Amino acid sequence: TEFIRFSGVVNPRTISGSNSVPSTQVADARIEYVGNGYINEAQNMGWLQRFFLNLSPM
Amino acid sequence: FGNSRADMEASGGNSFNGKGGANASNTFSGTLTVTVDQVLANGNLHVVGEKQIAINQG
Numbered sequence A: 001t002e003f004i005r006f007s008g009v010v011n012p013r014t015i016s017g018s019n020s021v022p023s024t025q026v027a028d029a030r031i032e033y034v035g036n037g038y039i040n041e042a043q044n045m046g047w048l049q050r051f052f053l054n055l056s057p058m
Numbered sequence B: 001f002g003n004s005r006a007d008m009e010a011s012g013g014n015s016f017n018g019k020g021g022a023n024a025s026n027t028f029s030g031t032l033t034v035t036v037d038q039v040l041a042n043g044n045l046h047v048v049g050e051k052q053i054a055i056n057q058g
């Protein structure tokens, strides 16, 4: 599953025509596009590799 | 000058070369909607804004 969530503050004067406003005109833009399942799990580093990345010298 | 008493031969050289340089460039091509923080005495507005984006894995 994919979750696309948006949050922000919109001035009720930049809304143009068909109730549409570009995200660049929204203050406090919070945009999340996350996924689940093994497809998302395959994009995680892995505990040992993450530890080496954060601690291993060079 | 009967012998090599006056016979003379000499050479000398002195070469020096120094160089130096430095560069610094930066670019930014975004658009961000900010919010007023306070109104100054002269009418200038203190604007602060923030936007968080979670594409995936970070």
Ligand SMILES: O=C(O)[C@H]1C[C@@H](O)[C@@H](O)[C@@H]([C@H](O)CO)O1
Binding pocket: none
């Ligand atoms: O007239 C001199 O004073 C010289 C003539 C060269 O021969 C010179 O080299 C020296 C030599 O050392 C004598 O042994 O003598």
